[PDB]
């Protein structure tokens, strides 16, 4: 009371240091509010009832005279105090034309007095408050009338601007309403083009900002304005020697190319116009103006920056790429243009700036169009790997790895593929800097030049040989650098996943050699001291142990010789490994490889692979290497099929005590659940021993839903989980069918089509849930001839969901496919 008479006196006092002035303000603000939230109601009652008329009249009197103090840390902590008086006492019908006032200080009081006004829009506006703002929508049109008078060319002060703009960057935080009409919207753009001529660098930041969000706000008033001086201002910011100013000028067609791919992706979800989200094609238009200045912002770079932070040409690049994906092949003619000029210049930053350009726009414009250049172009671009410029070599790298992903035809085998892959290599094992760039584009061929399925040979097979003998050639040294290792292993993965049956032979061999430097890292398990060492030795084991899954996926039965020392070297790998690694993880990749090749031959190692497996399952503590021993429960399983039942009793003692948790969202169950689908299709009868408590899990967790409180992680949660819980009731129901116990499968099947029910109604859907859905329905027609299930069948949601599912083009094959089959079985279920 008086101790708050002293200190908001102490706020008005201006013989004293303005230092301790501010130390008086921001006291008394913290006498009335804090970040903290329920403290916050706990000073409002010291506000209102502890002191109830009080003062609190002479108070906020003495602040808003403090806001013309001389200082601005006078006005900084009366802003402060304003700020903190009207998040309480406005929405209370209190401080009413205290707010009308402030505006006519704006618009007619002092200098600072002006800072310190505007200075309290801004500090009360940045505030995130559904009710606040509920009483700060009343008040927001004093608040953009006097930021628009704040703002002005008339207006002397750029302190005052920045207020102004910052008081419209927090203020816009707030767009409802937002005054939809045009003539309050015409001012505000207008002192908006105002705010980006200022000379001033900072004010203009302000204003390019608060252009950005407003460009994520009402693109619908703004389509009109957008369409003259708006395209030159903004190549004039964008031209600006200005660096930051540069960047924000750079942040519009950022957030421009945001918005619109949001859109362009929301009208091919169209059915009908009603659905469509307004577009403004803002980016076609623009590009020919804006891509000029983007290739100049290329041109100028800096090696001096420090890497990962952004820069002009950096921001430039990623923006082109946001146009490459949103403009289309209309972002093309420019572009195409630049290179054109400047593939063959003599500054490097001319060359680095082309290929970077032409490795931009591979992506987004349809195939065809970037045929004819890139079958046409691209032997240049092989012969730029001997470039002076290592960066230019890289950008030249990426660039064709680009061309790999996309026009992989424009690669003409016979003329083009063997120069481009010894130059890769070459680039790989002679210039580590630019190496990981030749690696990717090496894995995306690998990819491209698969060739047919069964194939005798693809377009890889000459190239073969050498190329695995050149990766085993830099991976070979110990002391090689080890991104150069990993990725060279990964490129060498890619190349034995993607090849032709006679190269099998090669790739044994290659299996052989695999198996054979796990083995000799098993004793440089041993020479391990440094960290640096363990580090090394865990990403040495995973490269191999993913290079031998490869090996072994693509050898499929023939690996049956290798099996017996594969299964020796991991199990011998997993009894000294330990701890956060990620071999372990691999090394179940590899044997889960082994298990779906081998099959039933694979049952051997059961008996000794077993513990490891139970011992994966029932350590939470490392979540991803448990998931990983699912899957591989699931694996075995599947493969073995009838001889995995001894072993299954144990697994469903792991999956079902995994089921316990203290989280309502346990991360495992989708796959535990699928996992009883996987091992009720491969034991058959013996299931019905774990039917009475798998189906009460699955009902459940038919139950469990996101809420009205969706993050796209519990929808994407629940969708995942009755993923599991369809394979899981389609996998009983086909044991049940073929055990003939379909008696016992009785009682459960309502709850079946109680879910079909709840996901029919489910706007949230995954394709893969519908291809189970329809499986268990057909499924279900199989396992009840007698046509009792007709009476249940008949009913139109099952219609309009099987009907739903097979119409839609979106998905793939295998579930309209399934859709077919289940409505066959269906109709046919109608009578019997």
Request: charged share 20%; aromatic share 6%.
């Given at each position: ?71 601005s ?21 209190q ?32 505030t ?167 290739l100049?912002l ?15 040409s ?8 946001l ?22 210049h ?8 082309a ?6 726009i591979?992506?987004g ?37 680009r ?12 003329t ?20 990981a ?57 890619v190349?034995v ?8 032979s ?65 199990l ?26 081998m ?29 990983m ?14 001889r ?54 699955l ?44 008696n ?10 109680a879910?079909?029910n ?38 139109d949601?099952?219609?309009?969901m ?31």
């Amino acid at each position: 009371s008086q101790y708050l008479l002293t200190l908001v006196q102490a706020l008005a006092n201006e013989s004293s240091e303005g230092h301790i002035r501010a130390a008086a303000g921001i006291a008394l603000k913290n006498a009335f509010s804090a970040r903290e939230f329920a403290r916050q109601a706990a000073l409002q009652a010291k506000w209102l009832n502890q002191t109830d008329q009080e003062t609190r009249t002479r108070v906020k009197q003495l602040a808003l005279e403090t806001l013309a103090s001389s200082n601005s840390k006078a006005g900084q902590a009366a802003a402060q105090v304003i700020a903190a008086i009207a998040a309480i006492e406005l929405p209370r019908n209190q401080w009413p034309e205290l707010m009308h006032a402030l505006v006519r200080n704006v618009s007619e009081g002092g200098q600072h007095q002006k800072q310190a006004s505007l200075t309290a829009i801004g500090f009360i506006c940045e505030t995130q408050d559904t009710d606040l703002r509920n009483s700060l929508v009343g008040h927001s049109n004093a608040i953009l009338t006097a930021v628009v008078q704040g703002a002005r060319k008339e207006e002397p002060n750029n302190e005052v601007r920045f207020a102004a703009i910052t008081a419209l960057g927090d203020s816009l935080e707030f767009v409802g309403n937002n005054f939809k009409h045009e003539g309050e919207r015409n001012y505000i753009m207008q002192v908006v083009c105002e705010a980006t001529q200022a000379q001033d660098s900072r004010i203009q930041q302000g204003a390019f900002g608060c252009l950005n969000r407003i460009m994520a706000l009402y693109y619908e008033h703004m389509r009109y304005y957008m369409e003259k001086a708006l395209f030159g201002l903004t190549i004039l910011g964008m031209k600006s020697d200005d660096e930051d100013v540069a960047k924000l000028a750079v942040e519009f067609w950022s957030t421009v190319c945001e918005e619109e791919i949001a859109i362009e992706d929301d009208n091919a979800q169209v059915e009908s116009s009603e659905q469509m989200r307004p577009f403004y094609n803002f980016a076609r238009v623009a590009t020919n103006e804006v891509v000029p200045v983007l290739l100049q912002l290329l041109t100028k770079q800096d090696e001096d920056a420090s890497d990962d932070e952004y820069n002009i040409s950096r921001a430039a690049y990623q923006c082109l790429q946001l146009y490459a994906q949103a403009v289309g092949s209309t972002i093309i003619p420019p572009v195409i243009q630049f290179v054109e000029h400047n593939l063959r210049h003599a500054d490097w930053h001319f060359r680095d700036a082309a290929v970077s350009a032409f490795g931009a726009i591979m992506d987004g414009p349809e195939e065809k169009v970037l045929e004819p250049i890139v079958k046409t172009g691209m032997q240049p671009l092989i012969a730029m790997m001997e470039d002076e410029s290592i960066q230019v070599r890289d950008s030249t790298a990426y660039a064709l790895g680009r061309i790999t992903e996309a026009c992989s035809e424009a690669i003409d085998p016979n003329t083009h593929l063997e120069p481009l892959i010894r130059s890769l290599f070459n680039g790989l094992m002679n210039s580590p800097k630019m190496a990981a760039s030749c690696c990717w584009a090496l894995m995306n061929i690998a990819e491209r030049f698969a060739g047919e399925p069964g194939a005798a040979q693809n377009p890889l097979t000459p190239h073969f040989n050498q190329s695995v003998t050149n990766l085993l050639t830099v991976t070979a040294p110990m002391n090689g650098d080890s991104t150069v290792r990993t990725a060279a292993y990964e490129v060498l993965s890619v190349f034995v996943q993607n090849a032709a049956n006679d190269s099998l032979s090669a790739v044994a061999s290659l299996s052989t050699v695999i198996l054979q430097r796990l083995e000799e890292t098993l004793p440089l398990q041993q020479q391990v001291v440094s960290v640096e060492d363990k580090l090394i030795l865990e990403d040495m084991q995973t490269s191999l142990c993913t290079v031998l899954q490869a090996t072994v996926q693509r050898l499929d039965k023939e690996i049956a010789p290798q099996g017996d020392r594969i299964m020796q070297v991991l199990l011998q790998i997993l009894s000294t490994c330990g701890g956060k690694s990620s071999v372990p993880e691999g090394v179940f990749a590899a044997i889960s490889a082994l298990a779906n090749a081998m099959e039933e031959e694979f049952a051997k190692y059961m008996e000794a692979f077993a513990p490891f497996l139970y011992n994966a399952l029932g350590n939470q503590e490392e979540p991803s290497l448990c998931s990983m021993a699912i899957g591989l429960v699931s694996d075995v399983t599947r493969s073995l099929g009838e001889r995995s039942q001894p072993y299954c009793d144990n697994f469903m003692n792991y999956l079902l005590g995994n089921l316990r948790s203290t989280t309502l969202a346990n991360q495992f169950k989708p796959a535990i659940l699928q996992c009883f689908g996987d091992i009720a299709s491969a034991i058959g009868g013996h299931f019905e021993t774990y039917l009475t408590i798998v189906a009460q899990v699955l009902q459940q967790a038919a139950t469990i839903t996101a809420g009205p409180d969706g993050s796209y992680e519990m929808i994407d949660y629940v969708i995942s989980l009755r993923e599991g819980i369809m394979d899981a009731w389609g996998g009983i129901i086909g044991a049940m069918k073929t055990s003939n116990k379909t008696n016992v499968l009785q009682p459960y099947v309502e709850s079946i089509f109680a879910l079909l029910n709840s996901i029919a109604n489910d706007p949230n859907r995954s394709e893969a849930l519908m291809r189970a859905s329809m499986g268990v329905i057909g499924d279900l027609a199989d396992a009840y001839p007698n046509g009792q299930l007709a009476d249940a069948f008949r009913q139109d949601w099952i219609t309009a969901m099987i009907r739903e599912t097979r119409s839609n083009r979106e998905f793939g094959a295998r579930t309209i496919e399934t859709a077919r089959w289940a409505r066959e079985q269906v109709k046919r279920q109608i009578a019997g």
